[PDB]
Amino acid sequence: TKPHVNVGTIGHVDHGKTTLTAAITTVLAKTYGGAARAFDQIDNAPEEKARGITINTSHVEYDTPTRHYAHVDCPGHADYVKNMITGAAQMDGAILVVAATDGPMPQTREHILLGRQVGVPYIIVFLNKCDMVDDEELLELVEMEVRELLSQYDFPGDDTPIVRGSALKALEGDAEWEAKILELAGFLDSYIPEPERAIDKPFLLPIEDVFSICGRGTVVTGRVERGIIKVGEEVEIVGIKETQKSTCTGVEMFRKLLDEGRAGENVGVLLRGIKREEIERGQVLAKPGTIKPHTKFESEVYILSKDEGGRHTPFFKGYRPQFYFRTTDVTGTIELPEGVEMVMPGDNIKMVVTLIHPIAMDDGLRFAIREGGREVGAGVVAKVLG
Ligand SMILES: Nc1nc2c(ncn2[C@@H]2O[C@H](COP(=O)(O)OP(=O)(O)O)[C@@H](O)[C@H]2O)c(=O)[nH]1
Ligand SMILES: [Mg+2]
Ligand SMILES: [Mg+2]
């Protein structure tokens, strides 16, 4: 039915993210229905669990006339880091809250940086606490500083919608300020496009298993991650070895012969021109020339604290864990930032990883870091280096 969009409020502590989340729910409920949430209900965020990682996050839901929004708001900076790296849902857009009285602060920069790294594709700005600013030149200055900051991190700062408002005075009922929250919800709808459907994206099937129908050839099984594979279409086996080229001779779903396989479907893809022995764990089926195998990438990673079931001790330069991309662990070597000798449990770092085998990889791809079979961290491919 109506499109689902994943959003959230980012920005420095005390800039008014929680008050804004409340003001969004309240004003949108007061004008065209829904349930209004109080400041207190969003402020004391419950503890959420993402495979051992503990994150304090408030999940609020609100509707505009044409869209349904699942909104994330976190109490502290640490939760934002965790949520952007390992959180339940990847943001389709973010609302960056900047207090006009402070202007951009260290966490403002950090969240913009993380958002770029993690692939948050759109940012809208709410210039908060305007009820406290009497100097228009001060507002223009803050607004210019924010546009420059966004542009520095490859966001289109010159084209970014910036709403001047007051989350407090709007929760309070002041209609002149409540107009600006509707202006903000308007930009959520107009500026964040509906996220691309999995079925529309180029074909990708992570290979979960391989069998060989007698007389029909090699069957590669898995859940179609994206797009459609039609019988007769050319495919590439991208992964652990030199990329191979084949043709889909059939698609099967529990003995049912299909003409195609679509995203979200569990299917058997038949490849007449390949043998089982040529199929390796970590490999992927994909639309030729849509995904490249890489060994080297830049990632933003979060290391679990001992409390979260992770390490108790730090790791160093020679750390060689397993990187679980989609179906298998691949060992990698790590390059830490210049000046960094160790990484503590509970920390986030920018890591340059070199895998021992190439993996079909695109920016934004999430992985798990495992030592043995135990999860020690989670990460996101920020940049593919080769
Ligand atoms: N003057 C003013 N105070 C505000 C506004 N929005 C929030 N506040 C206050 O700023 C403080 C921090 O806001 P809050 O939403 O809890 O910040 P957060 O840490 O970013 O979530 C609280 O004392 C709020 O009452 C606003 O627009 N104007
Ligand atoms: Mg808050
Ligand atoms: Mg720490």
Numbering used by the authors: 9 to 394
List sentences quoted exactly from the publication behind this structure.
To challenge this hypothesis, we introduced the T382E mutation, a potential mimic of a phosphorylated Thr residue, and used spFRET to monitor the EF-TuT382E nucleotide-dependent conformational cycle. Thus, the presence of a negative charge in this position is sufficient to mimic the effects of phosphorylation in EF-Tu. E382 that replaces the pT382 is involved in electrostatic interactions with the switch I region via R59, as seen in the case of pEF-TuT382. All these results strongly suggest that EF-TuT382E is a bona fide structural and functional mimic of pEF-TuT382.
EF-Tu brings aminoacylated transfer RNAs (aa-tRNAs) to the ribosome.
